[PDB]
């Protein structure tokens, strides 16, 4: 716990057009005025290589809110899965110019994934 | 156990509300704690002054929004305490008058409605109406009931306003 989310974390629960009405939907949302971990990982920067930095794995119970203030190209994708070691499928959303690679292929990961 | 009740003195004035734990003796709720004869009120304080009942709470307890603006609890006052000077040889004869015109709102009729015992029950279906007629006779009495309701609503307006034969100008 490092910061708080005042009124952020609301999305469209469905594709139903509603005009000047009030609707209640029981779905997975983000509670207002809650704790949002402000993880900062800037240990290695400027150089290349360094296939071993310091960051842990994050759990995914039912849903996460991912906000980021990256300037130009810091955030370039995510990595999902449950075992992450050649046993279950994963989900790479690696970002890139003009195209974003998406794949649900199953393979082995490393303890510190990064794009070089 | 019991039921909670939030006392909100309007949103256009302030966002300071108070909760009422009906039945709780203020010893089970996990900020002026006060125990009333109708529950546990958390959010208001009991003032000695007795004002007019603005927000009803229960068992004589009433709430309002009066001054630091906050919610205060108080026993409602039934009115002023007038003392008529009764005497065996004293009478009060009025000398002036004041013609006052009051108003009284009384409804006469309501919205006349009529439902369908086939379209509302069976939505654009064909085999649904086949089994609808075999599930009983609960489709002809409701239409007659609604027709009687409409006739009653019309007779009310006919007997309330149309009480004279000549239309005077």
């Amino acid at each position: 716990s490092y910061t708080n989310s005042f009124t952020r974390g609301v999305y469209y629960p469905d594709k139903v057009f509603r005009s000047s009405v009030l609707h209640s939907t029981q779905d997975l949302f983000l509670p207002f005025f809650s704790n949002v971990t402000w993880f900062h990982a800037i240990h290695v920067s400027g150089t290349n290589g360094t296939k071993r930095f310091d960051n842990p794995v994050l759990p995914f119970n039912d849903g996460v809110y991912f906000a980021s203030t990256e300037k130009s190209n810091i955030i370039r994708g995510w990595i999902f899965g449950t075992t992450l070691d050649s046993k279950t499928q994963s989900l790479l959303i690696v970002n890139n110019a003009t195209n974003v690679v998406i794949k649900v292929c199953e393979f082995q990961f490393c303890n510190d994934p990064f794009l070089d | 156990f019991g039921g909670v009740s939030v006392i909100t003195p309007g949103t256009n004035t302030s966002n300071q509300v108070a909760v009422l734990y009906q039945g709780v003796n203020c010893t089970e709720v996990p900020s002026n704690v006060f125990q009333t004869r109708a529950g546990c009120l958390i959010g208001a304080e009991y003032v000695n002054n007795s004002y007019e009942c603005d927000i009803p709470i229960g068992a004589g307890i009433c709430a309002s929004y009066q001054t630091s603006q906050s919610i205060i609890a108080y026993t409602m006052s039934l009115g002023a305490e007038n003392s008529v000077a009764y005497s065996n040889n004293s009478i009060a004869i009025p000398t002036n008058f004041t013609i006052s015109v009051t108003t009284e709102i009384l409804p006469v009729s309501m919205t006349k409605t009529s439902v369908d015992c086939t379209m509302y029950i069976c939505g654009d279906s064909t085999e649904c109406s086949n089994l609808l007629l075999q599930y009983g006779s609960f489709c002809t009495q409701l239409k007659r009931a609604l027709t009687g309701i409409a006739v009653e609503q019309d007779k009310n307006t006919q007997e309330v306003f149309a009480q004279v034969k000549q239309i005077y100008k």
Partner: protein
Amino acid sequence: LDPLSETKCTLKSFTVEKGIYQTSNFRVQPTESIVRFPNITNLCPFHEVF
């Protein structure tokens, strides 16, 4: 989040008038499941079989 928001959800409106409005029902949650049982005296004579 707060009782005012619960009142807003109950009335299904962002503007709540002046008055008392019920929102939910209070209930203390029970915990220790007491599995009380009587003595255990009439044990089966398994010592005379083995």
